[PDB]
Write a protein that binds this DNA or RNA. Sequence first.
RNA 1: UCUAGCGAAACCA
RNA 2: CGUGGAGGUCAGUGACGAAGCCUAGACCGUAAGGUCGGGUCGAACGGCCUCUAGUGCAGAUCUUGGUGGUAGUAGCAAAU
RNA 3: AUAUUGGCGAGAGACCGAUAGCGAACAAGUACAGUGAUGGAAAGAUGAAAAGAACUUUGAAAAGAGAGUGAAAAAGUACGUGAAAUUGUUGAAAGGGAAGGGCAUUUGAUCAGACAUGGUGUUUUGUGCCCUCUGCUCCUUGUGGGUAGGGGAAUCUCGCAU
Lengths: 114, 190, 124, 126, 288, 394
Amino acid sequence: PKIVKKHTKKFKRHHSDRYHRVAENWRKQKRGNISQPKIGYGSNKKTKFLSPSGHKTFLVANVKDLETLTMHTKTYAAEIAHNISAKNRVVILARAKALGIKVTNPKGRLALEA
Amino acid sequence: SDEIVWQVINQSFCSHRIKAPNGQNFCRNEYNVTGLCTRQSCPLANSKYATVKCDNGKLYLYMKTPERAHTPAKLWERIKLSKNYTKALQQIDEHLLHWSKFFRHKCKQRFTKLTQVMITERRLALREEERHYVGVAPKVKRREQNRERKALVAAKIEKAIEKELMDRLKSGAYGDKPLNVDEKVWKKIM
Amino acid sequence: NPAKSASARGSYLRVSFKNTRETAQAINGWELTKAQKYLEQVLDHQRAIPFRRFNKARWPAKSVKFVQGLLQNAAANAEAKGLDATKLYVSHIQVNQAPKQRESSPSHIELVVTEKEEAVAKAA
Amino acid sequence: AKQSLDVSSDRRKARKAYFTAPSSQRRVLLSAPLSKELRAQYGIKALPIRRDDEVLVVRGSKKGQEGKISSVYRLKFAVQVDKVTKEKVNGASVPINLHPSKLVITKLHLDKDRKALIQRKGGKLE
Amino acid sequence: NITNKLKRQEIFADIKHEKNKERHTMRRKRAKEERENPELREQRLKENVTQTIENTRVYDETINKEVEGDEDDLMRYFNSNSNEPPKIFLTTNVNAKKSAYEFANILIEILPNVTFVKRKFGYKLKEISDICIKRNFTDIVIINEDKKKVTGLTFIHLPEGPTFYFKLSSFVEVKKIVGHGRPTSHIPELILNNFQTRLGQTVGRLFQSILPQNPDIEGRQVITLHNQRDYIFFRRHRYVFKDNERVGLQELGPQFTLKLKRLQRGIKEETEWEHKPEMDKEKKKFYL
Amino acid sequence: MRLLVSCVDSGSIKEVLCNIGTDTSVQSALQPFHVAPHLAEGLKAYVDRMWVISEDEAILARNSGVVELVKISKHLKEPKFDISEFEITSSVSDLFDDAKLESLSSKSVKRTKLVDGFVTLCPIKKDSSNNTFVAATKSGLLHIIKKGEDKKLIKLASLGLKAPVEFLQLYDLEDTDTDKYIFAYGGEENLIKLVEIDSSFQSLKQIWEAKNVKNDRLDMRVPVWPMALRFLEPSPGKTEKGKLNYQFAAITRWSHLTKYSTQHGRKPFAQIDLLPNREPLSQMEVFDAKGENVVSSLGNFQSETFNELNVITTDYKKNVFKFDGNGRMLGKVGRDDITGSSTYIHVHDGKYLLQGGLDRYVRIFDIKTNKMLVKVYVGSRINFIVMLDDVEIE
RNA sequence: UCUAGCGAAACCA
RNA sequence: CGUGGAGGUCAGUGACGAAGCCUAGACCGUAAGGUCGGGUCGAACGGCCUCUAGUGCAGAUCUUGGUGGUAGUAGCAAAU
RNA sequence: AUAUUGGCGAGAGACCGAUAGCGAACAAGUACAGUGAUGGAAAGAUGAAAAGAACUUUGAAAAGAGAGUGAAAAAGUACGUGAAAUUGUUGAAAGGGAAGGGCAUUUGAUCAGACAUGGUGUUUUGUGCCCUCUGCUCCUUGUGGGUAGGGGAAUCUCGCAU
Ligand SMILES: [Zn+2]
């Protein structure tokens, strides 16, 4: 469907630029030119957790995790975890293209030689 | 006991169950037809069960009866599916006669998916692969960068170029008054 | 290009850091021998080092001494590399602070001298 | 696992035992396994190494090398074998400190203390 | 000995300090004695020699060994014929991006009778080889790009000639070069350096075959491939034959670095030579 | 040790006199006593196959289809030793047919075009005084070469086989008295076929053909490219009437070790994936682990037990492999010393390994200890080596 | 009195 | 939602690079935050169901450490 | 039979992991301060091996530069990793006694942006768990599972390849 986002930017603390010690996470203060988080900005329940590709992401550590997305190919998309070694990433890619599952992050820690 | 087993599996630890970022759950149960871990889905929570599943080449229908709740080695019954797609769906509807709609529907779906996966694997086996993947070790990459820097700094290539050009020039190889060299400068060489 | 470039590095140099920054900014982008003759004129108080940030033009001796020491070092390193002297001009120079105590404000001075390029007239 | 109470399995105690060991205990620690041939000779697997005997290297970067031990550097839990050295850029020589767990003894230097030790360990000593 | 941090650091720093004092005094005293006598200066420099890696390489019999049957092999596996110029074919790999097209456009001006194609899906290399034989192409060049960066080169001589896979590491465009220079239509001379091993002479004869012969002496242009430590460097330059006997340069076109990864017999048939990191760890062979 | 090396890049032979421990790569090592170039004929006509008859003559295979008998002398090198000097005595030409090969160049796995080569050069008879040798082409041409009584090579017959013949192995085990001449051959979609030829050498009879296996894990057809073969002793026990009595083993292209019992039948009862991803394999030699000589002069493994069979193969990369009868890798052989695709390997006398390939290096390896004995630089691509007698000069 | 050298602290939404 | 530790489990990840750091790189969350790319890096670490707490900081003229301006200024035993 | 923050020893920990934990993981009751009684710090990590940078050269000397070791000096006795505050240079932009952000958009710079390349039907030929005949074997004994030999596609038919 047509994904509505309701808020493109981020929600930052008041005076977060004014000091380097102050973080940028949302912390409630305890003018109105600051966008404050609230439940009205909560996205549509169908559209929630959707990539710009239109899938829901799913972290995959190994091939047995990849096989759990066998039936739900058009709905989900596999994302390789950040700490997977490069021997296993090519096996995961070959298995996923065999399964026909869209990998969100191919070409991670990998190159194509000859 | 099945609903007790189900509420143990649901409200406490199903070891096969995987939690998505969305909130949805996924059994890694090898017999589970859908990927999900729901009430109909867990093969552990249901004693009548069925599953399309492939052993090395051939696809088998796996049947689970409450009659064999004990003896889990003799639990699964195996049926060889036909290579005819229509005939094998007919075989599914035969062996799941007087059976519920969920198992027949998802079982046909899993069969179609596995057959199409077989088709794509045959395609990729026949597909030509020029490039192959290489992950590069950072140790190797750092040695490559630093040793290329050490080679370029070590070999002053420009001076050696000047050397070999003077070598070709004084050796001959350009004739008398070449177009490369000015005549006065060449006479200074001569 | 590392090939047509020599370098000189000085570390932990117990000098006033602010005066060294001024006299290093004064020397940037010059031919090496002209800059050295300029530094000799500084020692005779003939021409002064102009001060821009930390301030008018004084003659800070202790800075200029170490500067021309590094310039001699870079010239010797260029001649050991076998560069042209007349094409050789200082290209990069940087001073930054050394650690305070081992109240004083020492510094790390570095400079890169580079041959001037000359292009070739194209043929036909 | 650990059945006696008088045995302990603390990592901190074990490392404090290891690094603060006296030298007489160290030559017991500095032990090397014999060859298959020497096990066929004497019927015994591992022995405290000394310097007079001969050895081969079975691991490490200098794998498949051999020699007589120059000296046993017991203070560093290590052993300098002759002729396995790194030659520095001056031209001088410094041996690689090897470790006897990575060594296999080839030729023993037999002594009366050594022969009696083989006898007390059940050796079929010729 | 001492394992306190601040004591040990101080003591070793002072040992370094006294040592460098003594070394400065000793070199100054030797400098005075060699002011006096210029002989023992020479006796020192003949006595001790500065070790470098270029000085110390593992001996190879391939160095300074003549090639057996070099002319027949040279016409056979290489295009070395003044009668027959080469048809060179640019083969940029499937689903190429813009970067390899730019590099191919660069490589047009380097190589003679060069022909470009855009590869399409589903053409096997035997079929492409057969078509290039029917069109009498004598060598094909495959650009391997990745992540919008040109990473690999492949050279295949077509009459069952050998396959070469080079790894391109570092590339500089013409515009990022300071001493820019403008290249012209004139055919450059060529420089080959340090190809003295048998495999190195093979690669040198390869580049000698692929590059255009018969340079234009009028337009004083040259290209160069230097070998150092199994790293070959491509540059190109313009001549100033000075009165001062040192020729003057201006680096005209782009520069890059290549490294042979794979040398194979035939059209990807059997591999004569490969690169491995276990080859790299020895650090003194330098397979050229 | 004396070696004769077919040097491709010169198109010649080289005689090597070197002792055990000779390594040309190290100056400190032993250097070879004598290096001799011989019979340099250009790269278009390099030596393909050599057959040594006991000392005084050798048999050469050209790339021009010519088979050459060469007189071998010895003369003093002027540590003392004789060097060897070569003189061709007889030649039979015109034995290649590339017309079928360029005809079949479309249905071809390799990318290069196909040219004919002498794959097999050996006697037909296990008994000596044969004077009747065979020359097999890739074109399926099998030529019957007779040494004349005037000491002249004369061709007797030129029979055809199927197209590409990658290899042809003769069966020399038992009953040399009977006039039964069994060989096998195969190639690119050319099945392993057992053919008997008549002892009058005018007619052959295909006695057996293998059959392909069933479809794989992917239900795909398994490709057929056998690369090499050796024979064993036939089946013990009761013969089954009308099957055949032959047992033998083979190496494919696609990393399959295939064992064949004709008593079982035409399909493989045993086929093994040796390497992952169907890696190409080049040659196939058989060996005892203790360096013993357990084969025929044609190398056929003189046993009935497939589990006793141990093999050494090479890929088209730099690898040399050992395998058991089951496919378990016994080890890699000299993997740290070779850098080229070993074109040629050979078990000499059970206890030596002739290696030579694209590495321009002749490597005598030990069979049992798996240690390199001799490394020699030769300056040429190597495709064939014969090993003469061990000499241990000084 | 100038240069050179050395070189603070108070205080600091 | 996050943090240290604990029981179970994922025959979870990991020297073909864990953790950490940077990231004018991308993504998902209303947010707390989470996921990945790249760079650096060298040896451990995570997800889930539970347990447990020395469990979440901008301020307290808070404690300790580091670094500014003041300032080349004051000034010349302000420490030498 | 009981107490035991001391001694001599052990063995453990849902304890802390170098601003914590003892003041003290380190030459800590130390250096130091006090006339004294007393008070009392800071301070752990090169590397697997010092293999701790031969030699040349600048340089009073400190420090360099070539060179080399090392897997890594993007580990040089200032040394694991190396954040922020703050500093220097270069580039870009803005400013001329200019302060910051929020929205929205251009411009400039820049990045991402298929290893996508298939499906349906028909046809050709070939092959096999396709057909036929002859078997063997496991039990969960059925709407089963595995597996061999020879023959054939001449005809049909399925799958595969083409
Ligand atoms: Zn579940």
